[PDB]
């Protein structure tokens, strides 16, 4: 064997797993790593284009290598947590706000 | 928008993606790369706050 002389030519016996959608998971499409909800798309790609982007270079699309289908990216829901309190002196109840 | 754009900058690190540095580097060498990215992004956030 030899290395560090030319671009690699034999690499990567790759195993594939099943595809799941509508539940946010970790994904890996040709080295594109990230987390989020995968769902069906309506945007149409040109034949040679792999994955789309937005105004702020955020990956909001991807193409499945095997079945040649366009999927979206939508992050797992998140937000701040707020506690509404009437004062520790007056009472000991609270009301919680998910924003 | 600019606050987001600052994410796509190496700031002197090997790669601007946080995961790709640790994917192909041992802990105590990638530590300095992560520490460089952290301070770059922290300064980019302080500017926006000011």
């Amino acid at each position: 064997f030899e290395l560090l002389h030319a671009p690699a030519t034999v690499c990567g016996p790759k195993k594939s797993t099943n595809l799941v959608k509508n539940k946010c998971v970790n994904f890996n499409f040709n080295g594109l790593t990230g987390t989020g909800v995968l769902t069906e798309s309506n945007k149409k790609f040109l034949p040679f284009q792999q994955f789309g982007r937005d105004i702020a270079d955020t990956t909001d699309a991807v193409r499945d290598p095997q079945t040649l289908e366009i999927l979206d990216i939508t992050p797992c829901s998140f937000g701040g947590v707020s506690v509404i309190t009437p004062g520790t002196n007056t009472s000991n109840q609270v009301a919680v706000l998910y924003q | 928008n600019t606050l987001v754009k600052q994410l796509s900058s190496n700031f002197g690190a090997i790669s601007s993606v946080l995961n790709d540095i640790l994917s192909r580097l041992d802990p105590p060498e990638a530590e300095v790369q992560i520490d460089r990215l952290i301070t770059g992004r922290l300064q980019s956030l302080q500017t926006y706050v000011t």
Binding site: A56, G79 | L3, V4
Partner: peptide, 30 residues
């Protein structure tokens, strides 16, 4: 449905307030 006058409508249609979801990716809330 919104009890706004005529000039208020003309003033509201002259200012244009997805970018929001694009910025929402990295913990930016409005």
């Amino acid at each position: 449905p919104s009890k706004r006058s005529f000039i208020e409508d003309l003033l509201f249609n002259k200012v244009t307030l997805d970018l929001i979801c694009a910025q929402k990716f990295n913990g930016l809330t409005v």
